[PDB]
Ligand binder design. Structure first.
Ligand SMILES: *[C@](O)(CCCCCCc1ccccc1)c1nnc(-c2ccccn2)o1
Ligand SMILES: *[C@](O)(CCCCCCc1ccccc1)c1nnc(-c2ccccn2)o1
Ligand SMILES: [Cl-]
Lengths: 548, 545
């Protein structure tokens, strides 16, 4: 499996398809601008989604104007970020058929590459998925269209999507819009970079360990990861099938909280519930989202696993203080047994089979540098992972724990693991109830890491993956930017373990002055609305300008 | 080495016995003080009217409680369905919230519903003398709704059986005929409710365990979508198996009781006490709807040959539905053999039965489990070899055996994905015919005692819907006639294997026994399923409403 001829051909075809996509976009944009030289494109692009939707609904703005202006912006920002892999060809005719009463009528939407779109590949950056066009739209894409939205691009992902960087051997490397030496986060990185630079008002991503929340935080936009089965995953392209211990979740990314709420409201409709009867038909509860009642907010400033950067810590602390001044009750709270939840439950659930299924995607392919040593490590014989685990344990317990829990096991041992996950979930729910919390405020990893380092700082997924394990809805809101004072204090950063993950993270988070920093908002399962209500509160207190 | 298990049986039997004497003493005191109460009339009131009389003050909770307690005690004498009297229920009786939707309603509980201070043995020695620390969530919710859970009812050992006997409390009998099984695993519930000793009960179902007892005993039952109700605090024997989900649900004498129970359970108390349950309140208007339905139906699953009674029940129900304005459409979910032999069996026994078997170490194996334990205990290589040998002549037996082997997490992932895609397949098949609901035969009449464990094939009609995770319920529609029974002599299964042979003899001698049909809707469509069951009930037994 050393021959790369097939992988080379795939990359050649994918690069040509991307190139032609971009040229097509460029021509449509130019043809539109010629016919409409007087359109104030800037005013349109800076309209918050809610106002854009309202102008589309009234006819003040035509769907064509919104579409081509956003298309032009996407084409331009793509020049510096390489976030767009494919222009969704037929979308110009979808545009002229958008249901006029849709809650998203005329809204251009960007899709992580894994959302199946009829006639396009969802490569996931893998050569084995190239030249295999989807034969239908996935359910959420169908629902977006029935709501009058216009999906227009596929955006880049790191190879296989199992990464919080954003590069692959087919379409190459996506860069942070704020600083080209920084990762935009991942795996919904193309989305983060496109939306964070103003090239799309709304995107969909997916999240199994933070893949909606990393790019949102790194690129300074809002993102929500719902409860796993709140939205349909039917028709999504994946790399691993039937793993249910740690469920994948899909959700919106956008420039403000109102936009995520609008998106969930449009998605959680009869169309969705009929197209996919396996989704519990819970309508979006607007009144919970709009509530202005005082909250009991649990919080922590560190999970004692990944030492927060000075920027993360300042962000958390200032938010906590504004929430208290606003009349909320802030209560110290830390989910129990985080090291166990991350090392045993999460890692174990994601790699119950030693990585064998996951590795099947890589046979004969290039392994992108952004994946670090993951593929090499997964490839290690089970016995040798175990032996290495016992050796590293006295020195680097964190590294030993991960290694040990990435081993293959029987169905019997997986049942045991699944029961522990269920019990862990109940244990954190009980802590929460005993403290009578409404929501939970936590740090969110930031600022953006240097390109090619996320794959070498696996420990830093601790803040986000805990909530995939727990399957609680969790969103991120940008609340500040790194100051020079913050950046200089990185030199004093040691990490709790001082292993290679802490060493890499320390270096990767330096030189980040000016970069956005977020906090994370969490609520109980199926409480997406309450989670958004809290996010809305945070956004309003930290960045009052984002709301009318 | 079963001495400890004999001690467990001795202790359990003493507790059951003391529980029964306590019940009798309280019933005798109450009667002496209330010699003029019309017990007959109270006991026959449909639940809806009983609830209204408790709510209006026309009937006292004490009167209802002690009247049912006496009835439960009496019917237990011929069925052995009660394992425990829930010690503090009399004080719950006096603190029962007046505003509750179930105010003063005595409720029976399958033994796996944890009740503070009580064992949930599952008929297993290893669970004896391990009292629950607290009530399970559904019990908490019942009490918050003013209901009074008053007994634990019997289950077959481990609950993985559709008969109802275990080494601790012994064998439960069908109230209609003492030589017949009450079904299972919610068999105690079936026996108790079917003989009038309780107006409402809760069971669980992973392969038909709410529906068998309901059909065999001539009552109504609903198996909701797996995660519609909270399983928090439920006692189980296998943990972490998520391919085929356990579901919990109500059993009662009529459909309206089932809808009332779901309505009372699907409240803020439940959703707050167990946030992992999607907070979907009961949708009254779907339940109450009177719009004509597109009803898919089959007379047979081409897997278990229906008994003449089952077939007649299905056809008569179909005709009555057609005459009532509904559209009947022939429809059979695709690849049922696959769903049963590969998906369901493989899902239930992905580990070759090792987790299951753990419960039986040092314990007796009830005869009602047949050869299940012995078979599961065989080495994988031997199940495989035996499977290849059976395949030419007995493909059904071969398929089950081969799919009960242990496998890696990798293969379990593959299996889980196949279950998911099969669900999508049947849903697409269902939507291509634009169905609202699906009408199917339900296994019946009740099998002779100790035969269910030897007629595993017969779970075909029920287990398909655990695999697919669709709400499914059963409604009694007729009784076995002299002709139905005589026609059993002509009965031939499609396979001619031992399961077909056992079933044929097991369903004979059933004159007068109840027979049901099964109603099915799509995931999360419990209300539509109940709407349909209500219709079947109204059309086939008009006096229930
Ligand atoms: C993202 O959530 C992935 C974010 C990075 C997660 C890294 C997790 C980890 C844990 C232990 C060792 C190494 C790495 C995401 N988005 N999509 C997906 C995904 C994953 C699997 C299948 C489909 N999609 O992950
Ligand atoms: C009932 O639904 C069980 C009914 C009988 C199912 C027999 C299935 C079968 C399949 C293949 C070979 C042999 C037998 C029920 N109720 N509760 C449970 C249960 C099961 C496991 C754990 C907890 N509860 O099953
Ligand atoms: Cl669910």
């Amino acid at each position: 499996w050393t021959g790369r001829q097939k992988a080379r051909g795939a990359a050649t075809r994918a690069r040509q398809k991307q190139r032609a996509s971009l040229e097509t976009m460029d021509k449509a944009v130019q043809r539109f601008r010629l016919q409409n030289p007087d359109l104030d494109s800037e005013a349109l692009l800076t309209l918050p989604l809610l106002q854009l939707v309202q102008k589309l609904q009234s006819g003040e703005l035509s769907p064509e104007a919104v579409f081509f202006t956003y298309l032009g912006k996407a084409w331009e920002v793509n020049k510096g970020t390489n976030c767009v892999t494919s222009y969704l060809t037929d979308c110009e005719t979808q545009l002229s058929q958008a249901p006029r009463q849709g809650l998203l009528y005329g809204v251009p939407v960007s899709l992580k590459e894994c959302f199946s779109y009829k006639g396009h590949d969802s490569t996931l950056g893998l050569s084995l998925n190239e030249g295999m066009p989807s034969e239908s739209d996935c359910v959420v894409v169908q629902v977006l269209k029935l709501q009058g939205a216009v999906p227009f691009v596929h955006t880049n992902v790191p190879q296989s999507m199992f990464s919080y960087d954003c590069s692959n051997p087919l379409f190459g490397q996506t860069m942070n819009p704020w600083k080209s030496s920084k990762s935009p986060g991942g795996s919904s990185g193309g989305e983060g970079a496109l939306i964070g630079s103003g090239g799309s008002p709304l995107g969909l991503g997916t999240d199994i360990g933070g893949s909606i929340r990393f790019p949102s935080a790194f690129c300074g936009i809002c993102g929500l990861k719902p409860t796993g089965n709140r939205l349909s995953k039917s028709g999504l392209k994946g790399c691993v099938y039937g793993q249910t211990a740690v469920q994948l979740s899909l959700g919106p990314m956008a420039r403000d909280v109102e936009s995520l709420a609008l998106c969930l409201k449009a998605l959680l409709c009869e169309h969705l519930f009929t197209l996919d009867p396996t989704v519990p038909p819970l309508p979006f509860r607007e009144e919970v989202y709009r509530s202005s009642r005082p909250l009991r907010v649990g919080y922590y400033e560190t999970d004692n696993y990944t030492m927060p950067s000075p920027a993360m810590r300042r962000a958390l602390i200032e938010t906590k203080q504004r929430l208290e001044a606003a009349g909320h009750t802030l209560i110290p709270f830390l989910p129990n047994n985080i090291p166990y939840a991350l090392e045993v439950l999460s890692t174990g659930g994601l790699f119950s089979d030693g990585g064998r299924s996951f590795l099947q995607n890589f046979k004969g392919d290039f392994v992108d540098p952004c994946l670090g040593d993951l593929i090499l490590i997964l490839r290690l014989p089970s016995w040798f992972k175990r032996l290495l685990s016992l050796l590293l344990k006295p020195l680097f317990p964190r590294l030993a724990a991960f290694l040990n829990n990435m081993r293959p096991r029987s169905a019997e041992k997986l049942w045991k693991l699944q029961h522990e996950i269920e019990m862990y979930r109940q244990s954190v729910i009980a802590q929460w109830k005993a403290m009578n919390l409404d929501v939970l405020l936590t740090p969110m990893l930031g600022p953006a890491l240097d390109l090619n380092t996320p794959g070498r700082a696996t420990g830093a997924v601790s803040y986000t993956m805990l909530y995939n394990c727990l399957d609680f809805p969790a969103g991120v809101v940008p609340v500040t930017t790194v100051t020079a004072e913050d950046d200089a204090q990185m030199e004093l950063y040691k990490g709790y373990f001082g292993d290679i993950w802490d060493i890499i993270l320390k270096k990767a988070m330096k030189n980040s002055v000016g970069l956005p920093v977020a906090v994370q908002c969490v609520a109980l399962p199926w409480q997406e609305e309450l989670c958004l209500r809290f996010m809305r509160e945070v956004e309003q207190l930290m960045t009052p300008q984002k709301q009318p």
